[PDB]
Amino acid sequence: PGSMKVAFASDHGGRDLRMFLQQRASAHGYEVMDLGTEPDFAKIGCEAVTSGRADCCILVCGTGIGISIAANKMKGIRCALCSTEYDAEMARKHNNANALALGGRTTGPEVAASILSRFLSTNFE
Amino acid sequence: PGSMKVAFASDHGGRDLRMFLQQRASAHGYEVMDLGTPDFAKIGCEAVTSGRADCCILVCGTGIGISIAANKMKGIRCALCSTEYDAEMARKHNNANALALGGRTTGPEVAASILSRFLSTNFEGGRHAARIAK
Numbered sequence: 552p553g554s555m556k557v558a559f560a561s562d563h564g565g566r567d568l569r570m571f572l573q574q575r576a577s578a579h580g581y582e583v584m585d586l587g588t589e590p591d592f593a594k595i596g597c598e599a600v601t602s603g604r605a606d607c608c609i610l611v612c613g614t615g616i617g618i619s620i621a622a623n624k625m626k627g628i629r630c631a632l633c634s635t636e637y638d639a640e641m642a643r644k645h646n647n648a649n650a651l652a653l654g655g656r657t658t659g660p661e662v663a664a665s666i667l668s669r670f671l672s673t674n675f676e
Numbered sequence: 677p678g679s680m681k682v683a684f685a686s687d688h689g690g691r692d693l694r695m696f697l698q699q700r701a702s703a704h705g706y707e708v709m710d711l712g713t714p715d716f717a718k719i720g721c722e723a724v725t726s727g728r729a730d731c732c733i734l735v736c737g738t739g740i741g742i743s744i745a746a747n748k749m750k751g752i753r754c755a756l757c758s759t760e761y762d763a764e765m766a767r768k769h770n771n772a773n774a775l776a777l778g779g780r781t782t783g784p785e786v787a788a789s790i791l792s793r794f795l796s797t798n799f800e801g802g803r804h805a806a807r808i809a810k
Contacts, residue, residue, distance in 0.1 A: 614762050616755045617770045623747035631740045634758040637781060638738055646741045657762060 552580035557671065558599040559585055560592035561611035565655040568663060569611040572653075575664050576609075581671060593621045600649050601627045607649045609667060615652035622650050634658060636669040643673035682795065683709040683729035685720035690735035690779040693787060697733060697777075700788045706795060717742045721752045724773050731773045733791060739776035746774050758782060760793040767797035771804075 557576050561569035566588045573583045584605050586595055596608035612618040615632045622630035630650035631642030634657070642648040651670045653663050682701055686694035691713050698708050709729055711719055720732035736742040739756040746754035754774035755766030758781070766772035775794045777787050 613769075614765045616757070616762060616766050616772070619743065619756065620747050620753050620770060620772070623744050629744050632743065632756050633740070635781060638740060638778070641738045642740050645737075646744060648740070648744075654762075657759065 552671070553582070555607075555671070556582045556584055556605045558596055558605035558608040559583065559611065560587065560589075560596040560608065561655070562589045562592060562613065564613065565611035568653075568655045568660055569609075571660055572609060572611070572663060572667050575667065576671070579668070579671075590621075593618060594625070597622055597625045597628045597650060601625070607651065607671075609670075610650060610652045611655055611663075612652060613654060613656045615654035615657070619652040622652060631670070633666045633670065634662075636665050639666045639670040640673050643670060644676050647675040677705045677796070678707075680731075680795065681707045681709060681729045683711055683720055683723035683732040684735070685711045685716040685732065686713055686735035686779070687716060687737060688713060689737065693777070693779045693784060694733075694735045696784055697735070697788060697791050701791065701795065704792065704795075714742065714745050717745050718749075721746055721749050721754075721774060725749070725751050731775065731795075733794075734774060734776045735779050735787075736776055737778060737780045739778040739781070743774075743776040746776065755794070757790050757794065758786075760789050763790045763793040764797050767794060768800050769804075771799040771801070 599605035755772035
């Protein structure tokens with residue numbers, strides 16, 4: 552986890568939850584790359600990953616749907632939109648996801664945190 | 677509603693859900709196209725990109741791998757939804773023309789109410805139309 556560089560970006564509404572998630576990531580040993588607060592925060596999160604500067608990016612959005620669509624439309628990005636820990640577990644084990652979209656308007660913080668936690672610790676098969 | 681052509685495709689494990697959602701859409705007046713049981717995603721999406729269906733519904737394990745692959749196709753916007761609100765926003769804000777559902781993660785009644793909200797919500801093209809890119 553001390554090895555893994557984890558990038559985060561959010562829209563305006565998602566800043567609070569993003570920072571909460573960053574702090575849970577730091578507290579479990581992850582290296583946090585806070586990419587800031589807004590399209591804009593789209594290319595930005597995904598480019599940290601594709602250019603090798605970050606191992607994955609965590610994108611915090613309204614529902615996550617618009618961002619998951621956009622993220623996946625980029626070369627070398629596999630973006631999972633998860634609403635349970637099982638989703639995040641599968642996203643990694645089966646889909647080698649390198650981006651997690653989370654919906655701040657749709658997912659409680661503690662649930663977003665347990666989804667994040669599982670995404671970060673699951674290895675690809 | 678009577679005017680809308682909806683395509684349906686699913687993986688092996690997703691046939692029960694697919695059929696069930698097909699029945700539900702038929703009875704609410706939709707024109708259903710059962711395309712059958714990641715070949716099935718390319719197939720679902722191609723009904724949309726060729727002009728044969730208005731949207732496609734894709735029943736998967738989690739929906740995650742299908743939504744990724746579906747979104748890699750030009751002119752496809754695939755929404756993996758787990759609530760009716762997700763479905764509503766996927767259409768209103770994102771103009772999704774593909775819905776991904778996870779048969780392993782979503783219960784049949786929740787999947788049907790997601791579908792029903794997906795099929796009856798229109799894109800808000802107007803507000804997005806004049807936004808200035810760059």
